[PDB]
């Protein structure tokens, strides 16, 4: 049972992402996914005891990049947190407010 967010990040970085990447055929150079983005995805959108839902999320971003490259314009999609909102849609879990003082 269970999965701490740290384990989910390690698993996503060494098992899921390469596997989904081979499944969709994108060259590794063509669609970078920074580990910071994976942290953001684990924290905001996919937050539950299973692992499947995280797989669907990362698979979604890779699909959108694929359609953007094969027919669109950019020769290298570059996921960044600033742009991430348009790839994965509206975030579910709002971040807690951060007071400074």
């Amino acid at each position: 049972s269970g999965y701490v967010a740290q384990e989910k990040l390690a698993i996503a970085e060494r098992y899921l992402v390469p596997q989904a990447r081979a499944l969709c055929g994108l060259d590794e150079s063509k669609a970078k996914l920074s580990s910071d983005v994976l942290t953001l995805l684990i924290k905001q959108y996919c937050r539950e005891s299973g692992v499947r839902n995280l797989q669907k999320q990362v698979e979604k971003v890779l699909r959108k990049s694929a359609y953007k490259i094969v027919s669109g314009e950019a020769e290298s999609v570059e996921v960044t947190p600033e742009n991430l909102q348009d790839f994965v849609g509206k975030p579910v879990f709002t971040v807690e407010r951060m007071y400074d003082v």
Binding site: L23, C24, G25, R52, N53, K56, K64, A66, Y67, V70
Partner: protein
């Protein structure tokens, strides 16, 4: 004065099986069964069951693939020609056709639309089948309460037939039709082996490749198939089955 009916069937099955790329799991079973069919006297009551068994086992396509259109430009027009709005669903199907063009070999998925009634969830499936060009089917599961439809029967029972999925996969010669399960969330609890359990074996994204319906006992791959569902509301569905499938929202 005598002919060779046994050789007639023993060759005609062979001839239908020639062009298919038959997996090694099957070839040995079909061969030993074909010999067992060759021994017995023609009228013997068991012999019929085997002539039937082979009649199913050699019929279902083994790798024959209805080639699917790849370029997305032409696909746009036929997708938009008889619906409007629903942009998110059309964006998904465009993503899918694109990736299929990129990786080469055709490959499937699982999807599950859901929304308020009458939005168009059920009339689009036929249009998608016309766009990607893979052959269509439809499979209502409203109110069903008998697992046999998804899993067939054991073949010693008289008149056993394989579960409805194999009948689909034979009726359309292709190997990767667009199955369309329908009204998944109204599937009943049948007070003995409620069907909702059996579907779990069918929809695993990875384990699906070894479906094991009882009648023809050799496992059949199904990964190429493109299932779709529909659900008026997404609460009734049992939790693991809710988890297997993507949830687009019209």
């Amino acid at each position: 004065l005598e002919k060779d009916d046994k050789d007639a069937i023993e060759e005609k099955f062979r001839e239908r099986l020639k062009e298919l790329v038959v997996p090694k799991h099957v070839m040995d079973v079909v061969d030993e069964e074909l010999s067992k069919l060759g021994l017995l006297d023609n009228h013997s009551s068991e012999f019929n069951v085997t002539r039937n068994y082979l009649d199913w086992l050699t019929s279902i396509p083994w790798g024959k693939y209805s080639n699917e259109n790849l370029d997305l430009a032409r696909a746009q027009a036929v997708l938009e020609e008889d619906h409007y709005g629903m942009e998110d669903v059309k964006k998904r199907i465009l993503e899918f056709i694109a990736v299929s063009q990129l990786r080469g070999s055709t490959q499937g998925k699982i999807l599950c639309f859901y929304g308020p009634p009458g939005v168009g969830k059920t009339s689009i499936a036929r249009s998608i089948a016309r766009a990607l060009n893979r052959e269509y089917f439809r499979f209502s599961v409203g109110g069903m309460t008998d697992v046999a439809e998804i899993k067939g029967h054991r073949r010693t029972y008289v008149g056993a037939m394989p579960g409805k999925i194999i009948q689909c996969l034979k009726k359309t010669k292709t190997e990767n039709p667009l199955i369309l399960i329908d009204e998944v969330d109204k599937i009943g609890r049948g007070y003995q082996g409620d069907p909702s359990s059996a579907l779990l074996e069918l929809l695993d994204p990875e384990q699906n490749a070894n479906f094991l319906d009882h009648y023809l006992d050799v496992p059949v791959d199904l990964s190429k198939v493109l299932f779709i569902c529909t659900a008026n509301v997404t609460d009734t569905i049992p939790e693991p089955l809710r988890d297997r499938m993507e949830m687009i929202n019209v």
